Design a protein around this ligand. Structure first.
Ligand code: AYC
Ligand code: AYC
Ligand code: AYC
Ligand code: AYC
Ligand code: AYC
Ligand code: MG
Ligand code: MG
Ligand code: MG
Ligand code: MG
Ligand code: MG
Ligand code: MG
Ligand code: MG
Ligand code: MG
Ligand code: MG
Ligand code: MG
Ligand code: MG
Ligand code: MG
Ligand code: MG
Ligand code: MG
Ligand code: MG
Ligand code: MG
Ligand code: MG
Ligand code: MG
Ligand code: MG
Ligand code: MG
Lengths: 328, 328, 328, 328, 328
């Protein structure tokens, strides 16, 4: 609009707190926060994760206890990640759909205790396979697409049966959203939301999640690269999201987060649909490490989360959800 | 994105409060609120306005007292509207730039008492002319454009001298923003913001403001129609805003509000600049009347304000600012 | 284009390395890298920076020696940051334009020794003021815009006189690019490029830079907030860039980097001009801390830089430039 | 953005090599190169092609030997073109799907010897028909669309059975991509890519390919014009590409190349999908002829390939792939 | 528009000549052709150019004779290129503005003999400098921008004085179009058109032009690269064109041609202004070489020219203009 100095001085609105508040484009609130939680089997168990300072793996009893504080803070949902015992792992990932699996038990307990709390279950095979890869392997070690979808569908159904309001398919198999949707619709789970991990990249930022859960130790290399997206590609993410919306997803997600803010922006602008983003384990760890060392002020936590809002995210999966909910 | 029932059911996200909160596109906060206030001369004066139930005209001492509660609620700014004594009115609108006028006195007092509170003064001649029209009249009763700008410029300078952080030129004279900007820059008032009333319509919704201030009793007819915009025109508002941004405005405003939400949307989308909207006296009165009669629930207040945010407004001038700041 | 599973399987292109390479949208090369360097006064001085593991402050002799390896690796440019002795600081920031200042001496030495190496000098007052703020302060501690520009202009001229091919104004004063351009043109420095820090945010990610240089210890708060951009604002960055291009900038920059990738994307798309991004000290430190702790694989370095390319950056200022130039 | 001389001088970035490198918009790499190769029957056979100086037709043993150097150079894929013996030609193009045809034998040999090398087979009937036209002819000499698709489908299946990672249907029959996709999916060849020749023009630039392979001697005239695109049409190419993506293509191609760079640009911009371009035999020959004559410097080779990248191509089929891979 | 096989078969319109003609998007006509001609000093001189088979350098008498046939064919304009005698070359390029220079003499003769024929003179210093570079050199061999513009302005004025309807500034100096326009307007040459070479690349395709004229023997390397555009850059061409239109150009040109068709497309789409393209000497030579060798049919000539029309060119500078005008 032909704005020119000195008629236009962009510092005027910045002069005072009141005018900064008046022109501020985005605001972060507790409504934007989803807390991922690592869930152990057994009872009375709490375990620190060395590569995620401050994060604990919790047995279900402990989870129920901690959840009361998260509900009180107004965090709208949890994303559950079971820490499967090694003895429950198999080549067919059968534990994924065990009605008495950790995820199913934890969902039933939380739905009963806190009916208004959102439970987002993880539809994925990596915590259940002996090899820790994100699906069923053929003879050459390749993750079979359609065979893996059969297991994911059973898993999603078992989560719906346990009372999950949202199932979140996080393994990058083609066409899984449509298959899971068809199965939920056919079984009468009309209102179970699907939060698709639509543009999930072959990233090294998932490093600490291995320590937390005990899944694949290989990250961002040749095996993952046959289903997770190449970090170099942006246009391809639009094709991923378009397919997931056509297949019935209620929400779509970009993962990792901060290293992919341009993707969040393009996805929100292109589809105008509910868009989510995951601030992953490695993003949490690198921030925490710098804070603990006195290299960065604790204020980077809210700045990092404000960035997701500005980029177009409706909600953010973040291990900082509790700390953020206090600072807000 | 080829979304189709039953794969897509838009009710799933609506099923539960937590998912509604996760997908909610806009949130209203106290940062979005500007409270207009009617200011009397003298001391220890409070007067109810019959056509604006609940709104009082206040002398400066009373204003200072009430402002403490508004600051406490976190309202970022006030928009001052002096109620000029009839004996101070003139054909040349000289009281507009009186260093001891109500607006100037009130600004000095508030800037000293509450340094962080935003003061938005009204750059307009209607409260100062004997005839109550929005400028200086020629022999035929026509509001002269450039002669009126000379007075507005002096008025804006007097507001800057009194300490106003923002001057808000509300009479629709062409080119006034550039003239006021040049004068402020030349006088060294480098950081005084200009909140232009850019797309201000020839509306009947200003009815109760006459009762509040004692300005022109004619609204939305032949005289006003020679400077205020025709309610039928939308494209013309884009040309108004473009000119005001080129001339140096820091913020641009649409007025009235709810009857012009499509204009707020087009202005925000077209220019991506700080966009404000005025929920005028008549919008306040019609809501209040219906609430008092038991015809509408008090919840329409937050719904009306949420509409401005959804349409693209960064801030809202609203007589409901105090009530809203409590309900939020 | 109505792409649907199973006719469309986005995994097919991901199946093999050769097809991933064929469809890869972006490639990072040494041509994209700019190395920031901290320069000490004196001779035979090297100092480790505790909050930036692996980064050293170097006297000019040491810089000349290290630069031979950077040139050999094919890094196209350095961005110089002098570490001003406390005794050279003043209220008028006079050392900024000292023909014998560290930046000027280092520029002359490098231009002579490596004629093809790009030297990007820092046009900024924070390393030269006693208080460490980004300009000249008035009585209230406010950074004066136009008075600061007078000093920046002299500084930019002194850099051009020392042989700098690029001057990079990094303090967010309004209109500085036009003022610096007019002065360079009037003095006959027709080909000195201006790399504007156009959208530079009021960020906490600059933490370790304080330790490196000894500038302002306050970051992302009330003083910085009167000139650096609010992290919440995206549209405002487009207005910043538009002004800098109109004023004559040859290149425009977003800072910080990864937490602002959506801004890089919008700026590149909106203006189609040479766009740069700064992976700042705090981004370097948090990555390095996690790598050193064994929490993240060293591969996150190339992933972080690939993200800037994918988002639309033409070049990247990064303390990882040497390590990246080897891994590429 | 109101850029004006002399504030803006576009020569500043051009002044020095380092700044040219910093602002360079596109870079060509070996990852962008696909080498077409002409394959003979028999053993120990190498034949020069007079109209393609430097290009040889090779028997499979020779191809295996030469391929080691191409793999070493990092060329990601070959596009195979069999030179069918006259005695193997027929009206029903049966040799197209012979499990012991040249293309099938060459694919099996290369997949075994170099597992990481991409093999792109040619799905086309012109090398197999007695008449050399691109399909099966009816009584009037018209190329029948759906009858030709039946043969192409068998051919594509035979290539998948031989181990081809990519099948590239190059005869312009309507709907062939969908038919080939359905057949591959139904047969369990889930990951065989389809590189569609989507916008293939009725061009005279294919002249030397006749000499290389021995297919149709008529080019760009009345018969070809009933399936290949009219050189005058641009919008029509968007409809061709849209259909091929809907039908399941993993990659889409424009052919010829340089005379159709505007088409490459429109296709990439319109669909944001993996886009390929063929620098055909005639483009190779005209460049080579001029180089050999001393009329053009050898640098036109990299300039020609850089043009495809700038226009939006992800990969380039080019007889210059080996020479380019050395100069890069 | 959801077009799908077999409801949509794109071959139907291709079935018959009549329907191809009905849907053909672009048509080439003699109105699109501009013939470049090389002009010698003296009388009764014709010289063949070995690297441009079929092209002759002509003295003015011969040019006048040949022009009668070009006018008869309906070619709308000639672009004149003088072949300056070595004894007329100088460091100050003074022959460029000699009222008795070849270009000026040829213009006067042609304007008198064929008043309706368009004469496009070349505003450039390379045929007049001893060194053959495209401007006046400083001590370091750098082409000075503003000093070169002073000479170009005199040259353009001398062409207007000689009767040229169009002056075509072909040396890439910044701001030259505005300078030439101001001078023409101030001298009263109100209707002299400026055909700006706006996006002229640092290309190797100009090879044969050296043989024709005797200008710089260096092409597409380090000296040319400081003013001609980098072949890798597309967005930059939009900035070049925008500046030339703002400065007063009546027509804008892309050069070279076929290797830059994507640029022609972007320029036409972005500005909707009269857009021209130069099919340069090297494009002519490579086509001619292949035709003479029997490698390409003569039909590639019309296909090459049809490509420029399809890409968005209004007119084409082409050495094939006479041959094309016959085949059309
Ligand atoms: C994503 C990783 C989350 C994190 O790193 O914090 C989840 C769904 N699991 C895997 C195996 O990628
Ligand atoms: C606008 C009217 C506000 C209202 O009606 O509440 C102001 C600036 N004044 C006039 C006279 O229109
Ligand atoms: C930017 C900070 C760079 C960093 O943190 O690495 C520079 C130009 N200086 C300041 C004071 O912000
Ligand atoms: C295209 C021609 C390639 C070339 O000319 O180099 C191929 C697929 N075949 C035909 C017959 O057009
Ligand atoms: C352009 C070259 C034309 C050609 O190669 O045919 C002209 C204007 N001159 C130069 C020196 O580039
Ligand atoms: Mg997984
Ligand atoms: Mg997917
Ligand atoms: Mg949002
Ligand atoms: Mg939200
Ligand atoms: Mg008024
Ligand atoms: Mg106006
Ligand atoms: Mg808003
Ligand atoms: Mg707001
Ligand atoms: Mg600074
Ligand atoms: Mg700025
Ligand atoms: Mg780029
Ligand atoms: Mg680059
Ligand atoms: Mg064919
Ligand atoms: Mg087709
Ligand atoms: Mg590309
Ligand atoms: Mg590529
Ligand atoms: Mg020239
Ligand atoms: Mg130019
Ligand atoms: Mg046209
Ligand atoms: Mg034309």
């Amino acid at each position: 609009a032909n704005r020119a100095y000195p008629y236009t001085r962009l510092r005027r609105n910045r002069r005072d707190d009141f005018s900064r508040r008046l022109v501020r484009e985005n605001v972060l609130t507790v409504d934007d926060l989803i807390l991922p939680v690592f869930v152990l089997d057994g009872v009375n168990q709490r375990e620190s994760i060395p590569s995620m300072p401050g994060v604990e793996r919790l047995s279900i009893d402990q989870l129920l206890i901690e959840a009361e504080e998260w509900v009180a803070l107004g965090i709208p949902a949890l994303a559950l990640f079971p820490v499967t015992p090694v003895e429950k792992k198999s080549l067919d990932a059968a534990e994924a759909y065990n009605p008495e699996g950790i995820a199913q038990r934890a969902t039933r307990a939380l739905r009963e205790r806190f009916p208004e709390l959102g439970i987002i279950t993880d539809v994925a095979l990596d915590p259940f396979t002996t090899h820790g890869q994100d699906g069923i392997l053929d003879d050459d070690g390749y993750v079979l697409n359609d065979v893996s979808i059969d297991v994911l569908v059973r898993q999603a159904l078992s989560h719906a049966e346990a009372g999950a309001q949202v199932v979140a398919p996080s393994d990058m198999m083609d066409g899984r959203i449509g298959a899971i949707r068809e199965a939920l619709e056919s079984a009468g789970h009309t209102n179970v939301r699907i939060m698709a991990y639509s543009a999930k990249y072959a990233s090294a930022y998932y490093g600490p999640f291995r320590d937390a859960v005990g899944s694949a130790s290989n990250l961002g290399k040749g095996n993952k690269a046959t289903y997770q997206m190449d970090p170099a590609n942006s246009d391809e993410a639009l094709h991923e999201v378009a397919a997931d919306l056509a297949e019935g997803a209620d929400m779509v997600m970009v993962k990792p987060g901060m290293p992919y803010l341009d993707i969040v922006r393009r996805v929100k602008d292109e589809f105008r649909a509910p868009t989510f983003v995951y601030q992953v384990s490695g993003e949490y760890a690198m921030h925490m490490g710098a804070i603990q060392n006195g290299w960065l002020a604790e204020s980077v936590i809210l700045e990092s989360l404000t960035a997701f809002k500005r980029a177009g995210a409706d909600g953010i999966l973040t291990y900082f959800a509790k700390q953020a909910a206090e600072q807000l």
